[PDB]
């Protein structure tokens, strides 16, 4: 896995600022690029946390694993603190497509075993069942990184 | 501050924004540009309360908290046919069907 | 720069062209009368919400402002999903 934290050992102080209406799960990509869950942040809460330069974070809805943005992008990488100022990680809702937002609400109302009982075209059953997951998003980001490289 | 509105008469709904600071009369001008009817042939309503032409959208109760892109505030519209103004008639939207069994 | 989207129940929705073009389906359909699209299968309680989504999308896309949730009532969720799928937005 090309997407992994750099083992810098260079301390970096960060404010995780939840500027979303979701309970946020911070996810740290370890030195093997494997996602590690961290304590959740309620909506409209912030925390000063201890991280390191070249460490990789993404942020998800704690309950549904829906994608969230951090400083208007996918990944957050702590840098060197200048003048004892912490790095701000501003976590926001993306503008979901209306389809994805509808899939989110339907998933929140219907148990997975009952997706196939909905009066909708087969293609939408598969879309409901295609839950957001970090593993799949990391692979797309790994290809986006090599594409730019 | 931008306010986001649904201007509604009979079975017509205009989706548009304006300034919180802009006037009821200045909104009648946006309506004229789209529906080709002069301001003097227009009345605007918030619920059943007729809006005075001078008052701002802010003063009428349309703000960031009531007039949002994902949740716009309804402005009522009644036209004048020749002589006198019509009674405010906003046709409600259709009713959603009963929640499916698997969603209860 | 305003177009008309008409629901199955004959509700006429007048929205900015740039907003309606959020839908690749509506773009293709603009290629009824000029600047009018009839939706035979989308009733007013769904199409009103699609127009609200257009407003939301154009306002908050590439905005550094805090983005609020797009609310969907449970009773319209399934129909709005089918509409979203058809309109590709
Ligand atoms: C309260 C709260 N709420 C929401 S999130 C949150 C919270 C709570 C506690 C901490 C403590 N910090 C870490 O765990 C950092 C975070 C990341 O950078 C890896 N870290 C490490 O410490 C890792 N590490 C430690 C080192 C040392 C060589 C430098 N390298 N990596 C390991 C895991 C010990 C392996 C951080 C955030
Ligand atoms: Cl939800």
Q: Residue B1 burial by CB count (10 A; 0-12/13-18/19+): exposed, middle or buried?
A: exposed
Kindly tell me the burial class for residue A132, based on how many C-beta atoms sit within 10 Å of its own C-beta (0-12, 13-18, 19 or more): middle
Does A131 lie at the interface with B, CB-CB under 8 angstroms? no
Rounded (10°) angle between helices C44-60 and C74-87:
70
Domain count, chain A: 1
Q: Chain B: residue nearest A117 by CA?
A: B102
Distance from the Cα of C30 to chain B's closest Cα (Å) equals 18
Count of all residues that appear for chain B in the document: 104
DSSP state of C6: E
Q: Which residues of A touch C19 (CB under 8 A)?
A: none
CA A15 to each of CA A5, A12, A48, A86, C59: distance values in angstroms, whole numbers, following the listed order: 18, 10, 4, 6, 27
The residues near C27 (Cβ < 8 Å, ≥ 6 apart) are C21
| DSSP characters over A6-29 | -----EEEEEEEE-SSSPEEEEEE
CATH number at residue A40: 2.60.40.780
Domains of chain C, first to last: 17-86 (3.30.710.10)
CB A60 within 8 A of CB A29: no
* The two three-digit tokens of residue B49, written as one number: 């309360």
Secondary structure E strands in B10-89: 12-19, 42-46, 49-50, 73-79
Smallest-distance ligand from the CA of A16: 1
Residue of C nearest to B97 (CA): C75
Domain that holds residue A77: 11-93
Resolution value in angstroms:
2.0
Question: What crossing angle do the helices spanning C74-87 and A98-109 adopt, rounded to 10°?
Answer: 150
Residue C2, SS3 per DSSP: strand
A39 in ligand 1 pocket by Cβ < 6 Å? yes
C-alpha–C-alpha distance, residues A24 and A17, integer Å: 10
**CA-A28 nearest atom, ligand 1:** 17
Atom 2 in ligand 1: which residue has the minimum CA distance?
A: A39
CA distance B41 to chain A (A): 38
The pair of structure tokens assigned to B31 is 């309506």
Please give the backbone phi and psi of residue A71, each rounded to the nearest 5 degrees, phi first.
50, 45
Say if residue B27 is exposed, middle or buried (CB neighbours under 10 Å; 0-12, 13-18, 19+).
Answer: buried
Option in B4, B34, B103 nearest C55 (CB): B4
Task: Quote the number of domains for chain B.
Answer: 1
The domain spanning residue B19 has which CATH number?
3.10.20.90
> Measured between alpha carbons, how far is A18 from A22 in angstroms, rounded to an integer?
8
User: Which of C76, C84, C86, C89 would you mutate first to test chain A, the one with the most A CBs within 10 A?
Assistant: C84
Domain containing B66: what range?
Answer: 2-103
CB–CB of C26/C20 below 8 Å?
yes
Q: Residue B82: which residues within 8 A CB-CB, separation 6 or more?
A: none
C-beta separation of B70 from B5 below 8 A: no
d(CA C13, CA C61): 22
The arrangement of strands across the sheet holding A11-18 comes to: A46-52, A11-18, A87-92, A69-70
Question: In chain A, whose CA is at the least distance from the CA of C85?
Answer: A99
d(CA A80, CA A88): 12
Considering only CB atoms, A106 lies closest to which of C60, C77, C87, namely C77
Chain center to CA of A82: 26
Burial of B84 by CB count in 10 Å (0-12 exposed, 13-18 middle, 19+ buried)?
Answer: exposed
CB contact under 8 A, C14 and B14: yes
CA of A109 to the centre of ligand 2 (A): 9
DSSP A85: P
**C22 in Cβ contact with C58 (< 8 Å):** yes
Ligand 1 neighbourhood includes A76 CB (under 6 angstroms): no
Taking an 8 Å cut-off on Cβ atoms, the answer to whether B102 and A119 are in contact is: no
* Contact assignment for C14 to B12 by CB distance below 8 Å: yes
CB B87 within 8 A of CB B78: yes
The residue of chain C nearest to residue B91, with distances taken between CA atoms, is: C11
Residue A131 lies in a domain: no
C46, C80 in Cβ contact below 8 A? yes
Chain A with chain C: Cβ pairs closer than 8 A: 63
* Helical pair A122-129 and C74-87, crossing angle rounded to 10 deg: 110
Elucidation method: X-ray
With respect to residue A28, please indicate whether it lies within any of the assigned structural domains.
yes
CA of C71 to the centre of ligand 1 (A): 35
Distance (Å) from CA C52 to ligand 2 centroid: 18
């Amino acid at each position: 896995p090309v997407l992994r934290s750099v083992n810098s050992r260079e301390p970096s102080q960060v404010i995780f600022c939840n500027r979303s209406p979701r309970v946020v799960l911070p996810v740290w990509l370890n030195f093997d690029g494997e996602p590690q869950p961290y304590p959740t942040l309620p909506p409209g809460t912030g925390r000063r946390i201890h991280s390191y330069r070249g460490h990789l974070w993404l942020f998800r809805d704690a309950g549904t694993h829906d994608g969230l943005l951090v400083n208007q992008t996918e990944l957050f990488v702590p840098s060197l603190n200048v003048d004892g100022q912490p790095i701000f990680a501003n976590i926001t809702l993306p503008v979901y497509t209306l389809k994805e937002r509808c899939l989110q609400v339907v998933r929140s109302l219907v148990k997975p075993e009952n997706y196939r009982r909905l009066d909708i075209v087969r293609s939408l059953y598969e879309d409901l069942e295609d839950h957001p997951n970090v593993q799949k998003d990391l692979e797309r980001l790994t290809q986006e990184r090599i594409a730019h490289q | 501050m931008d306010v986001f509105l649904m201007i509604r008469r009979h079975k017509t709904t205009i989706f548009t924004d304006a300034k919180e600071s802009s006037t009821v009369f200045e909104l009648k001008r946006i309506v004229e540009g789209i529906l080709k009817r002069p301001p003097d042939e227009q009345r605007l309503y918030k619920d059943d309360q007729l809006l005075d032409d001078g008052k701002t959208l802010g003063e009428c109760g349309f703000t960031s908290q009531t007039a949002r892109p994902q949740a716009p505030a309804t402005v009522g519209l009644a036209f004048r046919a020749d002589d006198t103004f019509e009674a405010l008639c906003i046709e409600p939207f259709s009713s959603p069907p009963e929640l499916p069994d698997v969603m209860k | 720069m305003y177009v008309k989207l008409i629901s199955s129940d004959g509700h006429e929705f007048i929205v900015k062209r740039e907003h309606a073009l959020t839908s690749g389906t509506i773009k293709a359909m603009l290629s009824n009368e000029t600047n009018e699209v009839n939706f035979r299968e989308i009733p007013s309680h769904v199409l009103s919400k699609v127009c609200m989504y257009f407003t939301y999308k154009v306002r908050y896309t590439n905005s550094s402002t805090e983005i609020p949730e797009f609310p969907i009532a449970p009773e319209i969720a399934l129909e709005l999903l089918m509409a979203a799928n058809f309109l590709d937005c």
